Amino acid sequence: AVPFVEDWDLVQTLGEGAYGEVQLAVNRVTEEAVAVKIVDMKRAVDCPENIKKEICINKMLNHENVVKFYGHRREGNIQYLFLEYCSGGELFDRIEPDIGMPEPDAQRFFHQLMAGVVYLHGIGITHRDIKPENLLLDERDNLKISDFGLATVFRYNNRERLLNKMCGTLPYVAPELLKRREFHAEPVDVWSCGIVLTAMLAGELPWDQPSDSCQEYSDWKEKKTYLNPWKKIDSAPLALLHKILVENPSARITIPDIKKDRWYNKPL
């Protein structure tokens, strides 16, 4: 990207994406900032197809709680994706370890998270890796869903399909990914949003994984909310978490009903 880097300072690394590292690029003349995701397609034989899909999905998106996609180009074996620079950083860094953040801040972010996910689901897209590292903040602390490297289409027009791919980040994945050969897309994203809410409120992930052998998950199934992280969480948001972190995805709360939840609507 020699002409580009003559005019744009690749100032620093912002982070890792599913398929590559993301850099802050600043135009020397205009000082416009853009995020440049740099993907080495030689790292996997299926990387070209995979990054092509991320690009394709990105072209479908336009929402205030989704990271803007500006464009892309290839040079040799490297794919460059040009994305909104979200100057508020990752939601992850608003979460004080073992403490979380103030409840009003968690609620606001959660509302914005719901808005983004509703939008994605409405266009038939599931993100599949919702976590604080993939939720960015703009200059006014508006939440933006980031990184569609693991995203896929679960509804073609008005026809849903079941998914089967075990992907995502283990502490955030729904138990059906470890239990059912096929499953519905939307409840998996709802579950990860519940784990994000948990992390925001208590600064602590509740379990390594929602599997039968994970004691911390068994403790939750057994309603032991007198243990961490749950004992740090007020009963109101905890009541919502009780509805989101339901093992049977068919019994799990849907987003329309999350919007009816008492804590969701609570003036703080």
154 binds ligand TQ1 (CB under 6 A): no
Q: What is the contact mask toward ligand TQ1 in residues 101 to 120, using x (rule: CB under 6 A)?
A: --------------------
Please, which residue, 48 or 89, has the CB nearer to ligand TQ1? 89
Report helix, strand or coil for 15: strand
91 binds ligand TQ1 (CB under 6 A): no
Give the HSE-up count for residue 25: Cα atoms under 13 Å, Cβ half-sphere: 19
Please, which residue, 35 or 240, has the CB nearer to ligand TQ1? 35
Whether the Cβ atoms of residue 163 and residue 193 lie closer than 8 Å to each other = no
Which residues are the active-site residues?
A: 129
Whether the Cβ atoms of residue 43 and residue 54 lie closer than 8 Å to each other = no
Residue 238: CB atoms within 10 A of its CB come to 18
136 binds ligand TQ1 (CB under 6 A): yes
CA atoms of 97 and 233, how far apart (whole Å): 14
CA atoms of 218 and 120, how far apart (whole Å): 31
Q: Check the annotation: does 64 bind a ligand.
A: no
Please, which residue, 146 or 192, has the CB nearer to ligand TQ1? 146
Residue of the chain from 18, 22, 163, 201 that contacts ligand TQ1 (CB under 6 A): 22
189 binds ligand TQ1 (CB under 6 A): no
Q: Where are the alpha helices (DSSP H) in 150-234?
A: 185-202, 215-221
For the record, the structure tokens of 187 come out as 């409840």
Q: Please spell the DSSP secondary structure of 165-180, one letter per residue.
A: ---S-GGGS-GGGGT-
Residue of the chain from 9, 78, 87, 219 that contacts ligand TQ1 (CB under 6 A): 87
Contacting range for ligand TQ1; rule: CB under 6 A; set: 12-20, 120-128, 149-157, 235-243: 12-20
Residue of the chain from 25, 35, 151, 255 that contacts ligand TQ1 (CB under 6 A): 35
Please, which residue, 81 or 241, has the CB nearer to ligand TQ1? 81
Binding region for ATP: 14-22, 37
